[PDB]
Structure 1
Amino acid sequence: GQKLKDWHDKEAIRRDAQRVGNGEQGRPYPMTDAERVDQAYRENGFNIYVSDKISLNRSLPDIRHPNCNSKRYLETLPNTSIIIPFHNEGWSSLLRTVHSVLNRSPPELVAEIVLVDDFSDREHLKKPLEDYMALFPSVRILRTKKREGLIRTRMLGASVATGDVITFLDSHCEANVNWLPPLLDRIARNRKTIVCPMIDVIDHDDFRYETQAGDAMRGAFDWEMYYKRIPIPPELQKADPSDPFESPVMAGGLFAVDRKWFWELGGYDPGLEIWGGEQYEISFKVWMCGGRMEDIPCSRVGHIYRKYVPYKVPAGVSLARNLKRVAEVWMDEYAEYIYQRRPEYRHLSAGDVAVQKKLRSSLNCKSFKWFMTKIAWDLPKFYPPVEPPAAAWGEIRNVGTGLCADTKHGALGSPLRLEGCVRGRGEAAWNNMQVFTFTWREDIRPGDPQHTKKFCFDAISHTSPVTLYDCHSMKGNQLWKYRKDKTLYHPVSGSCMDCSESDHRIFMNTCNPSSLTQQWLFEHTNSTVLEKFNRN
């Protein structure tokens, strides 16, 4: 019998809505010079002074899709073991995670909450934590005998879980309203599906709660294996935008997976060290070996992204080794695409993978080719295994002032000023960066077309100066056009690039294929590409 149910705790929603105080409803914390010190970050990578001044039960805004409130799920669902690994995690941030789980998860559906201590040295994580958690029956603390790392530490928790499905959560999260039922329901219908809630951001400074940019998006990666998020192609967008949707890769820290299914895949590669790579291993595993992976818009959990890594990592440990172990076992021929960018990965021992490779074959999995072609088919659109050639690169000299486009190596956000051309015959004492590349993405970024920087030419209005704002693979305000009239057309602003003849900064203005201050010249080119997106 599929007797459904409305798992919403209307009263709790009312009481949470009626809650008042600093940080309530997810609003930012009223920052003061006291909380703005640098010692407030030293321990966690996020503001612990602010965290301490916010209630461990603070309320959060319900930013779910309007349809989510209407959804209903199976009256009978499988119970879950919530595993939370931690290492020298802050006191309040950890307690807020557990409270959110306790107060926003139907007790009946929670078999147990297991906090797994990864050899923590912070004192508040010892007796105090124990006495405090002893007051909550469903909570249990498990400790490793030495530093094991998040991967193995999550494995420890998984090896003891008694619930039907294992739900993983980082130690600095905050479950939002009615987040668990929609995850359990999905796995109840498809045991081999791994599910991920939408991961929302909890600001490391004022702790405000808000969705990541772009909201519902597909997971992916660049060829250096940095996690990326790309938009859902129109042909994949569900009728009801609140419905479960496929994701090729998970962020890694928040997901639920049937316990039995989890071990059938072999959990995680025990060889993965402190951080990195397990998200790729497990994601490739679920798809390639018979399962699936889905993001559940109706389930949302806040997560605090660190401003920097506080803990320490043992000697002789790098992300490279983890990644290498993942590439060799599951990435087939695509692993090569990784080495062509990071050559040290070739003659770099990835340890013994024999055991792992044995796992893959015993599962009868598809090729990684299959994964790239049928699952992550949109990934190469933003991160092509082999990047198309650039249109133009070199120095950008303005016909008018005769000067060159330069930048005082201002990576943050210093306008694209104008300086006397160096041409490689200059002194590095004056700090001259006059090399640029008009990449295949129709954007302009400093450096050689082979050693470009993640900084693009971003312009707001049709008069503001150019900027080296972070590059976002979107033809937004980083979309340029180099026409035969020697001008850098900005379609999203309808204006062109100009510069004050009085030897001043470079700023947008009214286009004019007759002016000299708007006429630019690159050192090299490839008209075959300049004829690409210049016509409709």
Structure 2
Amino acid sequence: EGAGPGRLHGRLGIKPDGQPGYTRAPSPPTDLSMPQALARGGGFNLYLSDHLELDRTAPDARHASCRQLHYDLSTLPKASVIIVFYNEPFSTLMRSVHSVLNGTPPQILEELILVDDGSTLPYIREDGNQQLVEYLKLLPAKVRLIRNEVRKGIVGARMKGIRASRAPIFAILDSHIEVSPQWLEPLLLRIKEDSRRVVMPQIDGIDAETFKHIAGGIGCKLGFLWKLMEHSYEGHQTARLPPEERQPSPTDFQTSPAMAGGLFAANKAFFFDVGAYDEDFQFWGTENLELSFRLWQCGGVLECAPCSRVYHIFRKGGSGYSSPGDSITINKMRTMLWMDEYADLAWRVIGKPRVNYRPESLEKRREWRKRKGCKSFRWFMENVFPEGDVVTLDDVPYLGPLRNDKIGMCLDNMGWASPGHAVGLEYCHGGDTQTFMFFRKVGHVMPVNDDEACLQPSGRLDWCRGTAQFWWDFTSSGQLMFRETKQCLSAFGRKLRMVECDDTDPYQIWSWTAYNPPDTFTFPSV
């Protein structure tokens, strides 16, 4: 096999006749149209990917201080790397397998499980052309293939691989990645010291159009938006950390309230004891936040390892597969179980949806939660994510329409909660399009359906930032006063203009519904 640096599992993909079992493509056509190629490639430039080598060398994205560390590969526990895919192309999938095997010591790699989540591509189908399974015969025995007869989704595919894993630790990677050196050693050492740790590698990027390796700029810490999606700590949220954590060492392991992707390593025994995944989550979306919340509340710890780095092809100009439109909403309702009274806020932000969130199985998760002794979401916000803009629902004093009695009209986002457009004044009708909320920790006036969009003195919505350019004070007289200018907002003449503050001018007096949610969120009925 001839192993060594850069080929830790030997020379991969060689036939009996010493020639490669993968015929690689010529250089992409010179007249290629990137927008049309990105579409056909499910988000990546497939002409270029098929032309690149499966044994790609990648730059070492780690800080130089990560190379000064030593790992005794005989004391570390073995791990099972799990890659699940639905119609991932051959070149990107096999490049991932090659990267793992080339860059992972065999002492610490028990196996590499490939989970076909009901792929329909000919090169993967069991009734197909057999290209994949035939090429696997040219790879180490560690590489196994297991299939789901029907496509189950992220959670269904992940659980299949985890259940099939024989090692005490498993590591979940995507089917379109490349690793930096010594990516697994940091994870194993950290999980070895404490089995309750779920350790995430930090993600670098591979451009979808050019396939250049790109340094990841994402920090370690991740919060969440009330739209129920993870979000990196903003500058003003980092500023709220203890001084010793605002700028930690490149080598320090850092906790994170939330997980972004599904790239993490965990002790298999602990993973099942902490609830694994909720196997009634549908297809794609939000399982990372449900796991993040449950993990912390249930005794676990979520950490990121800046010295463990993996490259990831972020899609662009296309998508790799389909997903029902309601699967994302169901996954969000089920995640609200772990948010306790805060679910009322999240429920109003995503439009008060009424869907079949499998209530019968959700009550059983409610019982598992009480039987396990998991902690409240209040504890979560106060201890794991106290840097957020909303630690208690007291931090959202107002939620409802912003009405002006003089002209008899309320604020209206006019159809787009997405920022960049002007706000208007219209006859009040009570729909969510006229509902705004106030985050007092930052003075933000936002539409309830998008906590990333903030009112500005210009009368428009723009991307929220934790700065004085978006700070408002709602006075005891009902005025909307921009703090930087000390001017107040007026609805005079049906247009929105800033004017000298005067509590005697009725055109600048607003009413805003106080927000007094219940101590208990009761789910909507199906």
How far residue 344 of structure 1 moved from its aligned partner, in angstroms, is 3.1
Tell me, in whole angstroms, the C-alpha distance in 2 between the residues paired with 1:357 and 1:438: 31
Q: Any idea what the Cα deviations from partners look like across 1:356-388, whole Å, max 9, x if unmatched?
A: 223223322222221111111112369988546
Letter in 2 for 1:355: K
Aligned residue in 2 for 1:244: 253
Question: How much is the aligned-residue C-alpha RMSD, in angstroms?
Answer: 4.2
Tell me, in whole angstroms, the C-alpha distance in 1 between the residues paired with 2:339 and 2:487: 46
Tell me, in whole angstroms, the C-alpha distance in 2 between the residues paired with 1:110 and 1:131: 22
1:118-517 to structure 2, matched below 5 A, reads 118-126=117-125, 127-136=130-139, 137-213=141-217, 215-231=218-234, 232=238, 233=241, 234-237=243-246, 240-307=249-316, 308-314=318-324, 317-328=326-337, 330-345=338-353, 349-352=357-360, 353-380=362-389, 386-387=395-396, 454=452, 471=463, 473-475=465-467, 482-484=484-486
Q: Is the 8 A contact 2:38 2:209 kept in 1?
A: no
**TM-aligned CA distance change 1:456 to 1:304, over 3 Å:** farther
Q: Percent identity?
A: 33
Q: Any idea what the Cα deviations from partners look like across 1:289-338, whole Å, max 9, x if unmatched?
A: 22211100100111122234331235x7421111211212x222222221
Letter in 2 for 1:101: V
SS of match in other structure, 2:296: helix
Tell me, in whole angstroms, the C-alpha distance in 2 between the residues paired with 1:370 and 1:196: 23
Q: Is the 8 A contact 1:243 1:297 kept in 2?
A: yes
How far residue 95 of structure 1 moved from its aligned partner, in angstroms, is 1.1
Aligned residue in 1 for 2:43: 45
Q: Any idea what the Cα deviations from partners look like across 1:414-470, whole Å, max 9, x if unmatched?
A: 9x9xxxx99769xxxxxxxxxx9999787999xx85567956799xxxxxxx9x997
Q: Any idea what the Cα deviations from partners look like across 1:22-59, whole Å, max 9, x if unmatched?
A: xxxxxxx9996415141432342222223223222222
Letter in 1 for 2:270: W
SS of match in other structure, 2:34: coil
SS of match in other structure, 1:171: coil
Q: Is the 8 A contact 1:44 1:90 kept in 2?
A: no
Q: Is the 8 A contact 1:275 1:319 kept in 2?
A: yes
Tell me, in whole angstroms, the C-alpha distance in 2 between the residues paired with 1:332 and 1:299: 34
Structure 2: state its 5+ residue gaps.
Answer: 8-26, 405-413, 428-435, 472-481, 490-496, 501-506, 511-526
SS of match in other structure, 2:281: coil
Tell me, in whole angstroms, the C-alpha distance in 1 between the residues paired with 2:487 and 2:119: 64
SS of match in other structure, 1:298: strand
**TM-aligned CA distance change 1:423 to 1:227, over 3 Å:** closer
Q: Any idea what the Cα deviations from partners look like across 1:142-171, whole Å, max 9, x if unmatched?
A: 001111111011001111100120100111
Instruction: State how many pairs are aligned.
Output: 439
**TM-aligned CA distance change 1:332 to 1:74, over 3 Å:** farther
How far residue 240 of structure 1 moved from its aligned partner, in angstroms, is 2.6
Q: Is the 8 A contact 1:281 1:326 kept in 2?
A: yes
Tell me, in whole angstroms, the C-alpha distance in 2 between the residues paired with 1:394 and 1:60: 57
Aligned residue in 2 for 1:403: none
Tell me, in whole angstroms, the C-alpha distance in 1 between the residues paired with 2:214 and 2:268: 31
Letter in 1 for 2:164: V
How far residue 472 of structure 1 moved from its aligned partner, in angstroms, is 5.6
**Alignment TM-score, normalising by the size of structure 1:** 0.70
Aligned residue in 2 for 1:99: 98
